[PDB]
Design a protein around this ligand. Sequence first.
Ligand SMILES: [Mg+2]
Ligand SMILES: [Mg+2]
Ligand SMILES: [Mg+2]
Ligand SMILES: [Mg+2]
Ligand SMILES: [Mg+2]
Ligand SMILES: [Mg+2]
Ligand SMILES: [Mg+2]
Ligand SMILES: [Mg+2]
Ligand SMILES: [Mg+2]
Ligand SMILES: [Mg+2]
Ligand SMILES: [Mg+2]
Ligand SMILES: [Mg+2]
Ligand SMILES: [Mg+2]
Ligand SMILES: [Mg+2]
Ligand SMILES: [Mg+2]
Ligand SMILES: [Mg+2]
Ligand SMILES: [Mg+2]
Ligand SMILES: [Mg+2]
Ligand SMILES: [Mg+2]
Ligand SMILES: [Mg+2]
Ligand SMILES: [Mg+2]
Ligand SMILES: [Mg+2]
Ligand SMILES: [Mg+2]
Ligand SMILES: [Mg+2]
Ligand SMILES: [Mg+2]
Ligand SMILES: [Mg+2]
Ligand SMILES: [Mg+2]
Ligand SMILES: [Mg+2]
Ligand SMILES: [Mg+2]
Ligand SMILES: [Mg+2]
Ligand SMILES: [Mg+2]
Ligand SMILES: [Mg+2]
Ligand SMILES: [Mg+2]
Ligand SMILES: [Mg+2]
Ligand SMILES: [Mg+2]
Ligand SMILES: [Mg+2]
Ligand SMILES: [Mg+2]
Ligand SMILES: [Mg+2]
Ligand SMILES: [Mg+2]
Ligand SMILES: [Mg+2]
Ligand SMILES: [Mg+2]
Ligand SMILES: [Mg+2]
Ligand SMILES: [Mg+2]
Ligand SMILES: [Mg+2]
Ligand SMILES: [Mg+2]
Ligand SMILES: [Mg+2]
Ligand SMILES: [Mg+2]
Ligand SMILES: [Mg+2]
Ligand SMILES: [Mg+2]
Ligand SMILES: [Mg+2]
Ligand SMILES: [Mg+2]
Ligand SMILES: [Mg+2]
Ligand SMILES: [Mg+2]
Ligand SMILES: [Mg+2]
Ligand SMILES: [Mg+2]
Ligand SMILES: [Mg+2]
Ligand SMILES: [Mg+2]
Ligand SMILES: [Mg+2]
Ligand SMILES: [Mg+2]
Ligand SMILES: [Mg+2]
Ligand SMILES: [Mg+2]
Ligand SMILES: [Mg+2]
Ligand SMILES: [Mg+2]
Ligand SMILES: [Mg+2]
Ligand SMILES: [Mg+2]
Ligand SMILES: [Mg+2]
Lengths: 67, 31, 87
Amino acid sequence: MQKTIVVELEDRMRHPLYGKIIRTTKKVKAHDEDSVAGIGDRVSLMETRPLSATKRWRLVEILEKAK
Amino acid sequence: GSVIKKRRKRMSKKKHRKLLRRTRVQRRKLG
Amino acid sequence: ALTAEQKKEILRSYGLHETDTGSPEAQIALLTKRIADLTEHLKVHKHDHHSRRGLLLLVGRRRRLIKYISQIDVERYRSLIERLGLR
RNA sequence: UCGAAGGUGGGAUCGGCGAUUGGGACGAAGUCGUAACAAGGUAGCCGUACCGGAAGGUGCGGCUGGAUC
RNA sequence: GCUCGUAGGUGGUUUGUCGCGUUGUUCGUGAAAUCUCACGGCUUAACUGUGAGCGUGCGGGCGAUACGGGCAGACUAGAGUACUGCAGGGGAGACUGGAAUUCCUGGUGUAGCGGUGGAAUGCGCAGAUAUCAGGAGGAACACCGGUGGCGAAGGCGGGUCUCUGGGCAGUAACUGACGCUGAGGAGCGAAAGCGUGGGGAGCGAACAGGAUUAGAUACCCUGGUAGUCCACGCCGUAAACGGUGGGUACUAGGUGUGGGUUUCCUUCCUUGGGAUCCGUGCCGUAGCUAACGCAUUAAGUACCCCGCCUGGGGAGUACGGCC
RNA sequence: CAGCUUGUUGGUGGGGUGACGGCCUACCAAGGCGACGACGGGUAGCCGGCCUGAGAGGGUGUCCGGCCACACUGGGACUGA
RNA sequence: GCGGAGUGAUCUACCCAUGGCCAGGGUGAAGCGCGGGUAAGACCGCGUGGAGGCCCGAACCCACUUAGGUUGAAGACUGAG
Ligand SMILES: [Mg+2]
Ligand SMILES: [Mg+2]
Ligand SMILES: [Mg+2]
Ligand SMILES: [Mg+2]
Ligand SMILES: [Mg+2]
Ligand SMILES: [Mg+2]
Ligand SMILES: [Mg+2]
Ligand SMILES: [Mg+2]
Ligand SMILES: [Mg+2]
Ligand SMILES: [Mg+2]
Ligand SMILES: [Mg+2]
Ligand SMILES: [Mg+2]
Ligand SMILES: [Mg+2]
Ligand SMILES: [Mg+2]
Ligand SMILES: [Mg+2]
Ligand SMILES: [Mg+2]
Ligand SMILES: [Mg+2]
Ligand SMILES: [Mg+2]
Ligand SMILES: [Mg+2]
Ligand SMILES: [Mg+2]
Ligand SMILES: [Mg+2]
Ligand SMILES: [Mg+2]
Ligand SMILES: [Mg+2]
Ligand SMILES: [Mg+2]
Ligand SMILES: [Mg+2]
Ligand SMILES: [Mg+2]
Ligand SMILES: [Mg+2]
Ligand SMILES: [Mg+2]
Ligand SMILES: [Mg+2]
Ligand SMILES: [Mg+2]
Ligand SMILES: [Mg+2]
Ligand SMILES: [Mg+2]
Ligand SMILES: [Mg+2]
Ligand SMILES: [Mg+2]
Ligand SMILES: [Mg+2]
Ligand SMILES: [Mg+2]
Ligand SMILES: [Mg+2]
Ligand SMILES: [Mg+2]
Ligand SMILES: [Mg+2]
Ligand SMILES: [Mg+2]
Ligand SMILES: [Mg+2]
Ligand SMILES: [Mg+2]
Ligand SMILES: [Mg+2]
Ligand SMILES: [Mg+2]
Ligand SMILES: [Mg+2]
Ligand SMILES: [Mg+2]
Ligand SMILES: [Mg+2]
Ligand SMILES: [Mg+2]
Ligand SMILES: [Mg+2]
Ligand SMILES: [Mg+2]
Ligand SMILES: [Mg+2]
Ligand SMILES: [Mg+2]
Ligand SMILES: [Mg+2]
Ligand SMILES: [Mg+2]
Ligand SMILES: [Mg+2]
Ligand SMILES: [Mg+2]
Ligand SMILES: [Mg+2]
Ligand SMILES: [Mg+2]
Ligand SMILES: [Mg+2]
Ligand SMILES: [Mg+2]
Ligand SMILES: [Mg+2]
Ligand SMILES: [Mg+2]
Ligand SMILES: [Mg+2]
Ligand SMILES: [Mg+2]
Ligand SMILES: [Mg+2]
Ligand SMILES: [Mg+2]
């Protein structure tokens, strides 16, 4: 989808009453000034000003490329 | 006397099946 | 079914080094052979349910093994999938 | 152009009533039986099927939450 | 009901790293009021004010890596493969064996047979029952047979052949955590039942007659249709029960029985004694339990995951929906 | 309540805004959300607090205070920071 | 009306042999391919295909309604459906 990237975030947090550690994910959008990205691509991101309706993130650096 | 608990269920199920057999036709098939 | 001299001829062709018989690839190979022959056995004898359950057991085993190999290394996954047949 | 309201239409969905009809619960010193509890007088239950005013009966398989040697 | 398996949850031993969880400290925020502590004043109080906690949480920085988590690895102990053996009613298909029941044909032979608590209906005198020979057909497979074996469960035995699944033991050859469980889902799932087509001996819901009885829509008798059997689909339920979900570790023993392996009198044959693995029973200690009882096959001691319960009826019913 | 989404998901050039932004528009691609509950149905202002409780919890959101929404019902602009 | 013997299936009923005819639209069965789905299938989505006493509708074959005709144009028709 044309210079847009989707990063699936991760977070773990203490369950409020049963006290377990719940694993909760996200699916969020980040920018690509260059539209090169495979599937996988452990990458990092930081916030920006919105560039679309649900755009809030930007890719900063790509590491351990999709193998 | 644990069989009594089975007999109550038996009677209820028996009467329900008897009602269904009384109405397996447009008595109930329409509805 | 799958006598010794019948399993060796795919042990050399699918196992790694002249004695490998328990690697992911080897296990996929002979499970696939077993599933093939047992599917022939089930195309005849349509209603041999107790052996068809054994077939599903082998299928589940091979599915766990293919997911194992796809996690551990993906190039060998690709090679084994091309040289056996998937989907 | 967009536009609330309005109009037209076919659906969706939530309710009320409804001749008639079905079961449920609770009531009373009613009528017909006696099905279960003892081997409860044919051991009883489970599923299923058929039959019977009614409990129930019977068939098939099963259980012991029954017996016998 | 059982199993497989998706998401998820959970995960053996070890090395190094990250420091996300976790954890330490500080900074900031967590308004005021409220609540708590101490004083102060409204005559005390309620109420108020001031100072100190609360503000459990969150964001930044600086520490840590014991545990959890990510990553890069390693190991064989879990798991799986290989090899050698082993037991078995595990399954499917085809062919096939004998007893027995029924019927038919004939031989004999005559007045009963059958059945019951006692009878009658009924069968027979047109030749029944009985007996002999032959034949047709269907179903189930005596003795083996067990308390046993196998299968996830449901279930599974006449024999032979063909195909086929699982399980157990031993070697340590191989892989190297690939495991466990499993919401949903899928498959299998006694009997009854349903569809189509076959088959139909015996049995036998329904039905009919006889009997019993106050009645007898029953129990008993005489017949007897579906069904029971087969092929292929459907159904998806059972006291589908051990009324006990799966996995794993540990916690006296005693005694059977089933399948392996291994050491001592080893040729004293004894096919005794011991150890070990996997079953399968009984009895029993600790422990547990309301008690009954369970008790290394736990209902004990623990951990992981799932299913389920929250008084009895109404009701596993109505409505909706799916099949 | 299992399929919801077409200006919906993104991009480009524009427009527009105080400001980023499908906020709007022309074109291009066909994406985004969801079993961690989308979409839907019902109910409801939220909170520091208040009630209860040993606490965790359960109920509740009235005085005070903070935030939001509304102003007969529904739709829209103007001035002006 | 009865009987005997003949005549008739150039009408009509059925059948037999051999020919002919059915504008134009529409729908979209099996089958066959590709893809998804899983191990394999089921199954599903697309195409393709062109089935059917299939649909609409001329010719053609009928004859439902209605009006007309009813000393008819016609001893059974015409018009409109
Ligand atoms: Mg842009
Ligand atoms: Mg008692
Ligand atoms: Mg009424
Ligand atoms: Mg009684
Ligand atoms: Mg009874
Ligand atoms: Mg009696
Ligand atoms: Mg009785
Ligand atoms: Mg019964
Ligand atoms: Mg009866
Ligand atoms: Mg029985
Ligand atoms: Mg398993
Ligand atoms: Mg599983
Ligand atoms: Mg998983
Ligand atoms: Mg994990
Ligand atoms: Mg660990
Ligand atoms: Mg004072
Ligand atoms: Mg004071
Ligand atoms: Mg105060
Ligand atoms: Mg405060
Ligand atoms: Mg091992
Ligand atoms: Mg066998
Ligand atoms: Mg014989
Ligand atoms: Mg016969
Ligand atoms: Mg004779
Ligand atoms: Mg005879
Ligand atoms: Mg290795
Ligand atoms: Mg489930
Ligand atoms: Mg099934
Ligand atoms: Mg059956
Ligand atoms: Mg049948
Ligand atoms: Mg029937
Ligand atoms: Mg039949
Ligand atoms: Mg009888
Ligand atoms: Mg009778
Ligand atoms: Mg067969
Ligand atoms: Mg049940
Ligand atoms: Mg059973
Ligand atoms: Mg149960
Ligand atoms: Mg357990
Ligand atoms: Mg044992
Ligand atoms: Mg004991
Ligand atoms: Mg207990
Ligand atoms: Mg209740
Ligand atoms: Mg129901
Ligand atoms: Mg319904
Ligand atoms: Mg547009
Ligand atoms: Mg643009
Ligand atoms: Mg712009
Ligand atoms: Mg309101
Ligand atoms: Mg309390
Ligand atoms: Mg308020
Ligand atoms: Mg008020
Ligand atoms: Mg007013
Ligand atoms: Mg202005
Ligand atoms: Mg004449
Ligand atoms: Mg003639
Ligand atoms: Mg002619
Ligand atoms: Mg002629
Ligand atoms: Mg056409
Ligand atoms: Mg087609
Ligand atoms: Mg037609
Ligand atoms: Mg023509
Ligand atoms: Mg003509
Ligand atoms: Mg005609
Ligand atoms: Mg007329
Ligand atoms: Mg005409």
